[PDB]
Amino acid sequence: EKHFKYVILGGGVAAGYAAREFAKQGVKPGELAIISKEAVAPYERPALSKGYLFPQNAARLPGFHVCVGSGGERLLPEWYSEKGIELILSTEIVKADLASKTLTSAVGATFTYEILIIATGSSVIKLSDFGTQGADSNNILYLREVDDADKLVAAIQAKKGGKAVIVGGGYIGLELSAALKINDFDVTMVFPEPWCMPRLFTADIAAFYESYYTNKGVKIVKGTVAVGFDADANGDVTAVNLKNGSVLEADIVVVGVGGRPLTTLFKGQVAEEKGGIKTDAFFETSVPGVYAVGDVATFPMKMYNELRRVEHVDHARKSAEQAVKAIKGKESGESVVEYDYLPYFFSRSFDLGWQFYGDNVGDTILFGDSDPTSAKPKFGSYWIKDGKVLGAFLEGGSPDENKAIAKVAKTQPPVEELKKEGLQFASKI
Numbered sequence: 001e002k003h004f005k006y007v008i009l010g011g012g013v014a015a016g017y018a019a020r021e022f023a024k025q026g027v028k029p030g031e032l033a034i035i036s037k038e039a040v041a042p043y044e045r046p047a048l049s050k051g052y053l054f055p056q057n058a059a060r061l062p063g064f065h066v067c068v069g070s071g072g073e074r075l076l077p078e079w080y081s082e083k084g085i086e087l088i089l090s091t092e093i094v095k096a097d098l099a100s101k102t103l104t105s106a107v108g109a110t111f112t113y114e115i116l117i118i119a120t121g122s123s124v125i126k127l128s129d130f131g132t133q134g135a136d137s138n139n140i141l142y143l144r145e146v147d148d149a150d151k152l153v154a155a156i157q158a159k160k161g162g163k164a165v166i167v168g169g170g171y172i173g174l175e176l177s178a179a180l181k182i183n184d185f186d187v188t189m190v191f192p193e194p195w196c197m198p199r200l201f202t203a204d205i206a207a208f209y210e211s212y213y214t215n216k217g218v219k220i221v222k223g224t225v226a227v228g229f230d231a232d233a234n235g236d237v238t239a240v241n242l243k244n245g246s247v248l249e250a251d252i253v254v255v256g257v258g259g260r261p262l263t264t265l266f267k268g269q270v271a272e273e274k275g276g277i278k279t280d281a282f283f284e285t286s287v288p289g290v291y292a293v294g295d296v297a298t299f300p301m302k303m304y305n306e307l308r309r310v311e312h313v314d315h316a317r318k319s320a321e322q323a324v325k326a327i328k329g330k331e332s333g334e335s336v337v338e339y340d341y342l343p344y345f346f347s348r349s350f351d352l353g354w355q356f357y358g359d360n361v362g363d364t365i366l367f368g369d370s371d372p373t374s375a376k377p378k379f380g381s382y383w384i385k386d387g388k389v390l391g392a393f394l395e396g397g398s399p400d401e402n403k404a405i406a407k408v409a410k411t412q413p414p415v416e417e418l419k420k421e422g423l424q425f426a427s428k429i
C-alpha cells in the first residue's frame with residue numbers, strides 16, 4: 001500500500017500542469033504522486049488532432065509533453081524522478097473510497113492520500129455505446145489518447161489513398177476531416193446538425209468553414225447519422241449506412257460525437273451538477289481535501305454568475321494551477337483569489353485558425369472578409385447582449401488583433417454601428 005500526501009488521479013493536461021505548479025510551490029521528494037492509466041507522462045492532448053497527424057515532421061512523444069503547449073518548460077519523465085514526484089503509469093484506478101482516502105488499482109494495489117486532485121478528464125463517446133449495428137468493425141476509430149492516435153496513424157498508412165468518413169461536426173470532426181484530407185484521403189463528413197460546430201458557430205461563420213472545406217474537396221453530408229456499417233469477411237469496415245438510406249464507402253471511419261466527464265469513480269461520494277463534480281472557486285469538491293480540475297469540474301464562473309463546466313485545454317491548465325495554489329494556500333493559511341475565468345476557445349485546420357473569447361449570447365454581427373477563396377481570410381464576429389459586447393470571434397487574427405478581441409470580451413464595452421469597422425473597434429478599446 002502506497003502513501004502520499006498529494007495524489008493527482010489522471011495523467012493528462014491538468015495533471016502535468018498541477019505537477020508544474022506543485023514544483024513552483026516547493027513540493028518535496030516523496031510527497032506527490034500522479035496515477036495514470038496511460039503509459040506516458042502527461043502531454044499536451046491538443047497535439048493529437050493536429051501535429052500528430054502531419055504526414056511529415058509530425059509531433060511525437062516526448063516532444064509534446066507538457067508544458068510545451070503554452071510555451072512552458074518540457075516535463076520529461078526524468079523531471080518527475082529528479083523532483084521525487086512519483087509517476088505511477090499504466091495503472092487504472094477502479095475504486096476510490098473518499099471516506100478512507102484510499103484508491104485501488106485494477107490489479108488490487110492500493111494508494112492513500114491526504115489531498116486528492118481528481119483530473120480524470122473525459123471519456124470519448126463511442127457508437128458501440130449506442131449499440132449501433134456493426135460499430136465493432138475494425139478501422140472505426142476514436143481519438144482521445146496517444147494510444148488512439150497511434151492506431152489512427154497506422155490506419156492512415158495502411159489505407160493510403162483510400163476513403164475516409166468522419167462522423168460528427170464538432171471539434172473532432174472539423175480537425176480530423178482536415179487531417180485526413182492532408183493525408184491524401186477522399187474525405188466525407190457526416191453530421192446531424194444544420195451547420196458544423198452548432199454550439200459556437202453562427203450560420204454565417206459556419207457557412208464560411210463549410211465552403212472552405214468544400215473547396216478543399218471535403219464532401220459534407222448534413223442532416224443525418226450513421227445507423228450501421230458493413231464489414232468484410234475480416235470484419236474491417238467497408239461502408240457507412242446512413243439514416244437517410246444512403247451508403248458511403250469507407251476504408252477508415254473516424255468518429256467524434258462528444259465526450260463526457262469521467263466521474264463514475266465518485267458517484268454518490270461528491271455533489272455533482274451539470275454532469276460534472278461540483279466545486280467552489282478553489283476547485284475544492286463537497287469533500288474536504290478533494291479537488292476536481294479540468295474537464296470534470298463544474299465550477300462558479302465569476303464573470304457570468306453561473307456554474308459551468310468547460311472541456312477545453314486553457315481551463316485545464318489554469319484550473320490545475322489554481323487548485324495547487326489553493327491547497328498550498330490552506331497549508332500556510334490562505335488567502336487565494338477566486339478563479340476568474342475568461343473563456344478562451346480555438347481551433348486550427350488547413351491554413352485556418354480562429355479564437356473566441358467570452359460568451360456567445362445575444363445578437364451577432366459579422367465583420368471583415370469572409371471569402372473562402374482566401375488568402376489568408378480574416379473575419380470575425382461580436383455577440384451583443386444588453387448593449388454590451390459579450391463575446392468575440394476572429395479568424396485569421398495577428399497576435400495584437402487576438403489580444404484586442406480578448407480585451408473586448410473581458411471588458412464588455414457598450415455599443416450601434418460596429419459592423420462599420422468591426423476589427424478597428426477592438427483595436428481601439
Ligand SMILES: Cc1cc2nc3c(=O)[nH]c(=O)nc-3n(C[C@H](O)[C@H](O)[C@H](O)COP(=O)(O)OP(=O)(O)OC[C@H]3O[C@@H](n4cnc5c(N)ncnc54)[C@H](O)[C@@H]3O)c2cc1C
Nearest residue numbers: 010011012013014037046093120121294295311312313316
Ligand atoms: C484529441 C483532442 C484534441 C483536443 N484539442 C483541443 C484544442 O485544440 N484546444 C482546446 O481548447 N481543447 C482541446 N481538447 C480538449 C482538451 O485536451 C481537454 O480539455 C484537456 O485534455 C482536459 O485535461 P484534463 O487533464 O481534464 O483531462 P485529460 O487530459 O483527458 O486527462 C485525463 C487523464 O486521467 C487518466 N484517467 C482517467 N481515469 C483514470 C483512472 N481511473 N485511472 C488512472 N487514470 C485515469 C486519463 O487516461 C488521462 O491521462 C482536445 C481534446 C482531444 C481529445
Ligand SMILES: NC(=O)c1ccc[n+]([C@@H]2O[C@H](COP(=O)([O-])OP(=O)(O)OC[C@H]3O[C@@H](n4cnc5c(N)ncnc54)[C@H](O)[C@@H]3O)[C@@H](O)[C@H]2O)c1
Nearest residue numbers: 168169170171172173191192225256257258259311346347
Ligand atoms: N480545438 C478544440 O477545442 C478541440 C479539438 C478537438 C477535440 N476537442 C474536445 O474533445 C472532446 C471531443 O470532441 P468532439 O468533437 O467529439 O465533441 P463535441 O462536443 O465538440 O461535438 C460532437 C459533435 O457530434 C455531433 N453528434 C452527436 N451525436 C451524433 C451522432 N450520433 N452522429 C453524428 N454526430 C453526432 C454533433 O454535431 C456535435 O457537434 C470535446 O471535449 C472537445 O471539446 C476540442
Ligand SMILES: O=C1O[C@H]([C@H](O)CO)C(O)=C1O
Nearest residue numbers: 044046047050064068069313
Ligand atoms: O494547446 C496546444 O497544445 C498543442 C501544442 O502545439 C503542443 O506543443 C497544440 O497543438 C495546441 O493547440
